[PDB]
Amino acid sequence: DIVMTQSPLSLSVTPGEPASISCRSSQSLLRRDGHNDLEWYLQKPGQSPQPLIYLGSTRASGVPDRFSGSGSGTDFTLKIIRVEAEDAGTYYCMQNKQTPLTFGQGTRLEIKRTVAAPSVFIFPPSDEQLKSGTASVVCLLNNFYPREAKVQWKVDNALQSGNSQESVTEQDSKDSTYSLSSTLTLSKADYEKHKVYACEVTHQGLSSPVTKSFNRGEC
């Protein structure tokens, strides 16, 4: 099989600045016609991969001249002249010389933006969930940059450890921020036993950690 090597595996570029992604083939991809049997794809969050470059240097329909594929034989380069916010995602090179078609590991392009503190929101379990016998406390950290964020749960000032799960969205295609949801799971009896439910957030955009809390049953 033809081995496809990508360099780097991740990069962070500010919009208006260039990005370069190298691709190395284990065998030459040069064709008799002067072109190469090498393609470039972009995979945006939640989407299938979309073609950027084919035949080594030919842009796919609707791909702007900001994007270029260069190189021959074993060494290839994908260049983005000026990076836009919409460019966030994973870039893959692919050889189509022969089967099995092989891909590079993928390069994650992070759009670098200014530091943005999250807006924090806490949600008690709904009455309908409590009726069902369970309790989930949700904490939302909305539109933040950089990705590094810490959430600490406290129940009547007790530090919660191992009873929460979190998930982060991929970089937003328009504003280049991330969002995070953290869920605290407790039994209905433990929920009913306690009063103060607090979510403490640590982030670079915050000079001090922000706490959002509620008292079970409003008081």
């Binding site: 099989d1 299938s48 991969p49 979309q50 073609p51 893959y92 692919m94 189509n96 089967t99 099995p100 078609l101 092989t102 891909f103 590079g104 590991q105 993928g106 807006s119 929101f121 949600f123 379990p125 709904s126 309908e128 969930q129 069902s132 369970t134 989930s136 949700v138 939302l140 909305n142 539109n143 799960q165 979190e166 998930s167 982060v168 969205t169 969002s179 949801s181 869920t183 799971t185």
Partner: protein, 208 residues
């Protein structure tokens, strides 16, 4: 012009699945049909292909899937097929139909011995900018889709990746940030769809 992909979903380990790739505005027979897989948060892996009618419908298959795949075309139905047998948990991935000589949206294949379970949908009630949402809890397998106001509300929406809980059941939250001035007047409905269990729920999220 359009690609319809189906035949995926939950399959027990050792089981079989037949993926379908139906073409709309063109003749599949004139095109080469490929299948590419991607496990969640991983790279791309070519599975196999079927060359156009002119090129004698020649098939090639990935070594990792050796002797377990059968790729075909039903030209009367303008559809390509990927028959996969003796499926193992390592085969869990998004499987994409790739037209060569466009990439489909793909179909998820989950190789698990766990049973399908429809979700519970709970509101994340609000109270300048306010946040509200829906908690889509205790479902299997993936995926779940969430829209707001039948697709009329897209700005400020964040549908989070599902987390697998300790129970082996998935859970996800979908939220929207809205003007707090709109809270007593504008209606917010999350549209939940878990196709594996045929669970469709329209849940109105109110402030109190």
């Amino acid at each position: 012009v359009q690609l319809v992909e189906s035949g995926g979903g939950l399959v027990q380990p050792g089981g079989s699945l037949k993926l379908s790739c139906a073409a709309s505005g063109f003749t599949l027979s004139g095109s080469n049909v490929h299948w590419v897989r991607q496990a969640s948060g991983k790279g791309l892996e070519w599975v196999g292909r079927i060359k156009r009618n002119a090129e004698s419908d020649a098939t090639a298959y990935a070594a990792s899937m050796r002797g377990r795949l059968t790729i075909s075309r039903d030209d009367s139905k303008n559809t390509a097929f990927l028959q996969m047998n003796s499926l193992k948990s390592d085969d869990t991935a998004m499987y994409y139909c790739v037209i060569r000589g466009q990439w489909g949206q793909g179909t998820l294949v989950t190789v698990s011995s766990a049973s399908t379970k429809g979700p519970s949908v709970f509101p994340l009630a609000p109270s300048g900018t306010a946040a509200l949402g829906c908690l889509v809890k205790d479902y299997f397998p993936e995926p779940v889709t969430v829209s707001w106001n039948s697709g009329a509300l897209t700005s400020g929406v964040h549908t989070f990746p599902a987390v697998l809980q300790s129970s082996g059941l998935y859970s996800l939250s979908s939220v929207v940030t809205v003007p707090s001035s709109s809270l007593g007047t504008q209606t917010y409905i999350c549209n939940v769809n878990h196709k594996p269990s045929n669970t469709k729920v329209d849940k109105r999220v109110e402030p109190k």
